[PDB]
Design a protein around this ligand. Structure first.
Ligand SMILES: *[C@@H]1O[C@H](CO)[C@@H](O[C@@H]2O[C@H](CO)[C@@H](O)[C@H](O)[C@H]2NC(C)=O)[C@H](O)[C@H]1NC(C)=O
Ligand SMILES: *[C@@H]1O[C@H](CO)[C@@H](O[C@@H]2O[C@H](CO)[C@@H](O)[C@H](O)[C@H]2NC(C)=O)[C@H](O)[C@H]1NC(C)=O
Ligand SMILES: *[C@@H]1O[C@H](CO)[C@@H](O[C@@H]2O[C@H](CO)[C@@H](O)[C@H](O)[C@H]2NC(C)=O)[C@H](O)[C@H]1NC(C)=O
Ligand SMILES: *[C@@H]1O[C@H](CO)[C@@H](O)[C@H](O)[C@H]1NC(C)=O
Ligand SMILES: *[C@@H]1O[C@H](CO)[C@@H](O)[C@H](O)[C@H]1NC(C)=O
Ligand SMILES: *[C@@H]1O[C@H](CO)[C@@H](O)[C@H](O)[C@H]1NC(C)=O
Lengths: 166, 321, 321, 164, 321, 170
């Protein structure tokens, strides 16, 4: 997209993660499955929610048309009233549509960025103790089981705990 | 042997959104923000029913066009509904002075109480029930606007009229009266006796003197004469004084302004739908959670904000593979 | 060892754009979207020639100011052009009632057919050919507006006029007439005989009685008197009725509105350029595929959107080294 | 630059490349030359063309001024009328200018981005089979030919066949 | 091992800004751009003092209501301050024709010079010193508007008046006059003798004939009579001609327009505060370099731009810790 | 953050760097200290300054209310005038508020990007003569005295001078 992560180096989405928005798939000794990161999926829900609520609140003061009537010798003023009400309606319609166009693009590039930073926060939480497959995947130069996963999926994974495996 | 992946949600979603650089982008979650439907009917607005004028115009209602009687007694309303071109306006042709200012006033009024400022039975020296016309039938019989009175000479006399009414109430009073412009000097003599006539009207602010214009005109509803109507707001403790020697269409009923507030005069063809709503448009009522709608700009109530779009969809989720 | 690199395009381009944080960013490719030029002439619009009034005003054209004879009969037009301050307006000074509203109607009219509603030859008991003035010269001699007739007493008598015209056609008819306000009572009797006079005009909707105002005023084009002109739109199947015992400036010609549509009254000093265009401004026509322009905001035709910018450049390519 | 690619770690643009906006330069056994990434030099023109068209289309609903005339005892409304028109012209003059200014920024940051992601879709493939020279280039731990290139350009460069 | 770290600034700042996705982001450096304070006074504008009307309206001032003689002689001003509801308007009740249009003209005027165009002394065949009323007290005694003259019959006669005034200056002249509408035919005779009266006023462009209207009205300031005032701009070298046979309220003084420029009629309840400013609002003056302010929308001078916001803060630094 | 650097892989900011927006904390044989990055801080100060001035210049063409007066017979146009002035006022208040909201977000992401870019110019200069700790720090393989440190800050770290020495510590 803009951050190279969604539909980029990571080629596709996991039709099998009902868990959440961004996640992990682990394939190891004691079984293989999916797990969504609850940390940065919630953080992304808060951001999208406020963005929705702030867009609505911004259109709170938008123009409200009011009916006015004129006789047939007040044609100039009848015409001025019409052009100006339609004027404000076009202005606020442009504002709603454009703001939606712009924030949609940003909302996408946002998700794109969240996936990327998650990859990057794990990638340097591994250094050389693992190998970058390049398609969004890491292979371990060592042994790793479930209790080894809660460790990476939470933020702290010991670097000199497997540094010697080579 | 031991590996872990980082990836993102995907699913079976059809919902598409647009951006500046790409239209029709499939996304995993979206949020439609545009209400595009209504219930096609005219409704109570929060419990209070609209005044639906049907085929009457506002002037037909206020003056009392004898086809418009259905509105002799009206309860407090939430908005007024008038058709774009009402068939019943002025049975007897003429004009209504500053009509559109009056309509504008009405848009901030929810209730009137009719007061009988000059009873028809009160006219000792003028004929008060012979001013009727086939232009204004009431139940098969020639009649006239019901809230005002078309005085005619009595025993070949039309003595000068002097009448006052003091608004001793604590509310404003909407007062209507009229002048008749005859078709020729014979009709003038026939009706009012006096050849040269006037109508004067005074209030603390009003300073009016009207003179009939006698001319030959096209027949409208069979009539070559014209009736011209005037109005004023009579403030608390002010008085209004009329004086005339002919051509006077006198008030019988005035309208006390008993309740003001948010209202509207809605232009709509629709009829009463027997339902409730918190938001009304001339094309139907709206019931939605949505922040925007594209039904009609001219709404009343708590409504979503109007927009001219045909589609408004916010991306919430991410791009769907 | 071997090598592969990834780089980006560069060029000799000078083209500059702005961003919020940086002005004058030289990029490799850029799309200018603002039309800044025109042709300086007044052209036809899609092959239709505009009516160009030259030094006449809309009133001088419609009333038939004798100096304005170029416009006595006029072909269908696409827009009208009038100077900021035309030399020829009313040769005989006075006023044109509801002029600006009439000009407004014109903005939606593309052609008139003239029709002779009361031929000058039909006034048998009034002088119809002696109402002329030095204020309105034709070929150096006293003359008058051509579409309208200044009637005068005949044998020291001005019998009461009664005329009516019925618009039998299926189009609206614009009718014009006037009243003369003399400068003193002597002039009033010299021209009309009757000291106290009026003009009554009725249409199904018009109910008018005008009285002359005799007063002393500054000379304008030599005249202390004044003419005041009036108009109405006579709908299909309505009649207009005139009655008067003096001061009547009668219609002879009226204008049937035979072609409605989009049109405009442009104010411009320019003259006909013998060219064609899709987009006309008061400063000159525009040939352009650009989406914006900054020539003038009052255009007519298929035009780019007006914007006040002096420069509007879109970046397409990338930042140049 | 926002993504640090153009005018960044790649110090400048190649006057030499004329196939497109982004691309490659290689110096293998057989001479050297410039190659343009067609598949994403196109997605660029698709994006920019969409943006140019979307800007114009959003603008087609602009206010149009319409002349009105008033006499000299109608000064208040003549004034109201003039202010109303000037008013909408300034609102739309703003909208147009600001949209151009904001999108120009985004457009620049979009190229910047496509260049970084091309350097990434590449580096994610080769890895240890090449050296990160630094200036935006790659020194090979092995040898390449004019048919190894189509595979790195293609994005179907087989990694395990070249470990040695 | 030898280390170098990359990092970013942090500090003690508590300043917050908003974004679309997040509110109250604590930021390292922000910049308020919204002025929210004023000095609560009315000041000189660029050194030039305002004309502060105090308890008088513009009408009370130009006509010369005896309770406002403070403004008989006024120097050049920068803007005019009027109260929303001046206690002193028209001492003798009635109306001021096209009053708002005149007020509009004043906002482009910085100085008048009052000049005497028809001396009160020069009325030899009419009483010029008896048109007084207890509605217009001066020093507790009946008086009248100072700039016009209520002429009355003399020796039981009101000869027809014909005065004329020519503007020989280089400046436009504002001329004012009025008509008296009495409350019955008896008063008409007591005051003016002639039962049927008029006032004709002519300028090269004005063509006016006023007729007094008799009606029964409520007492305002103890008066059932009404005065109605009219005005015009007399061009350089044009003449104004008056003719009347009763009910005429003649000009005595008129106002020469000596300085045109940017000006305004500002509605404020404040009084003068002996200070200077380059930006004045109805609620107080602003001294600010801010690009925006939210004090009031109706400002004069060189002001920040008005917005309705309570808070406007631009982020300059980065997210704090 | 949008670029992962501020509040991200660089966990927090430094209260000790009073010198600028972005910079360095070195540590070596002579000892340790802070120092700003004069060019990035400058480039950014200018972009922020310009943004502020552009936003303000973009508003000087905004709507100015004018007082108009109407009598009691002109309620309809009195009401049209009021709704028109309120309408323009709301349109420009919306513009000012939204423009500030949108640009505050960009400014914040602008700093984020600047920090990431700073870190990456260093990363690319050092290459493998240094270890990437993961928190915005580099552990050198060679010896880096105050002279060698001003060099990576000035963006003139000479890789070939330390190639040989660094190769051996690996
Ligand atoms: C309307 O009728 C009322 C009731 O008599 C009049 O009100 C009195 O007016 C006098 C002075 O005119 C006041 O001092 C009294 O206080 C008023 N009485 C009340 C109860 O308010 C009023 O004047 C009449 N209106 C007119 C125009 O004659
Ligand atoms: C103008 O003349 C037309 C045509 O004679 C009149 O319309 C006829 O009017 C009668 C009733 O008045 C209708 O029943 C006919 O159908 C009409 N004929 C046609 C052909 O439409 C019209 O009324 C006249 N207008 C005036 C003011 O007298
Ligand atoms: C008002 O007075 C001026 C000045 O006396 C009159 O103008 C002179 O007018 C005559 C033509 O009538 C010329 O010969 C002079 O050159 C004029 N001089 C100026 C100063 O313009 C003017 O005519 C008078 N206005 C009226 C309506 O009588
Ligand atoms: C967008 O999709 C809709 C229907 O889903 C269609 O009307 C339109 O043609 C599409 N646009 C493009 C760019 O294909
Ligand atoms: C941008 O360049 C133009 C001329 O190419 C010049 O008018 C203007 O001063 C420049 N802007 C700046 C910021 O120097
Ligand atoms: C922003 O801070 C203000 C001041 O304390 C507070 O009142 C408001 O609720 C805050 N907004 C949010 C979303 O926390």
């Amino acid at each position: 997209g803009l951050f190279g992560a969604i539909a980029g180096f990571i080629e596709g989405g996991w039709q099998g993660m009902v868990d959440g928005w961004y996640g992990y798939h682990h394939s190891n000794e004691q079984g293989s499955g999916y797990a969504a990161d609850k940390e940065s999926t919630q953080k992304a829900i808060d951001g999208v929610t406020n963005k929705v609520n702030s867009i609505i609140d911004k259109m709170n003061t938008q123009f409200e048309a009011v009916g006015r009537e004129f006789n047939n010798l007040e044609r100039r003023i009848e015409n001025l009233n019409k052009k100006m009400e339609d004027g404000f309606l076009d202005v606020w319609t442009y504002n709603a549509e454009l703001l939606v166009l712009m924030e949609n693009e940003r909302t996408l590039d946002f998700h794109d960025s969240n996936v990327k930073n998650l990859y990057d926060r794990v990638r340097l939480q591994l250094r050389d103790n693992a190998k970058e497959l390049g398609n969004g995947c890491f292979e371990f130069y060592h042994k790793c089981d479930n209790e080894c996963m809660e460790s990476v999926r939470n933020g702290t994974y010991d670097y000199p705990q497997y540094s010697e495996e080579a | 042997g031991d590996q872990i992946c980082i990836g993102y949600h995907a699913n079976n979603s059809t919902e598409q959104v647009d951006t500046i650089m790409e239209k029709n982008v499939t996304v995993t979650h979206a949020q439609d923000i545009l209400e595009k439907t209504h219930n096609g009917k005219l409704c109570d607005l929060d419990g209070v029913k609209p005044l639906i004028l049907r085929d009457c115009s506002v002037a037909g209602w206020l003056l009392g066009n004898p086809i418009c009687d259905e509105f002799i007694n009206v309860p407090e309303w939430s908005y007024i509904v008038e058709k774009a071109s009402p068939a019943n306006d002025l049975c007897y042709p003429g004009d209504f002075n500053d009509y559109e200012e009056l309509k504008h006033l009405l848009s901030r009024i929810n209730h009137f109480e009719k007061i009988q400022i000059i009873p028809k039975s009160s006219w000792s020296n003028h004929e008060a029930s012979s001013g009727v016309s086939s232009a204004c039938p009431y139940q098969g019989r020639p009649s006239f606007f019901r809230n005002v009175v078309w005085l005619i000479k009595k025993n070949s006399a039309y003595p000068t009229i002097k009448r006052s009414y003091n608004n001793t109430s604590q509310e404003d009073l909407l007062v209507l009266w009229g002048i008749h412009h005859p078709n020729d000097a014979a009709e003038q003599t026939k009706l009012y006796q006096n050849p040269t006539t006037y109508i004067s009207v005074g209030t603390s602010t009003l300073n009016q003197r009207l003179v009939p214009r006698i001319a030959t005109r096209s027949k409208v509803n069979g009539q070559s004469g014209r009736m011209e109507f005037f109005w004023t707001i009579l403030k608390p403790n002010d008085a209004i004084n009329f004086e005339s020697n002919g051509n006077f269409i006198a008030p019988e009923y005035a309208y006390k302004i008993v309740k003001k507030g948010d209202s509207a005069i809605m232009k709509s063809e629709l009829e009463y739908g027997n339902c409730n709503t918190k938001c009304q448009t001339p094309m139907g009522a709206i019931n939605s959670s949505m922040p925007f709608h594209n039904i009609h700009p001219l709404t009343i109530g708590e409504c979503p904000k109007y927009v001219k779009s045909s589609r408004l969809v916010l991306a919430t989720g991410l791009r769907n593979s």
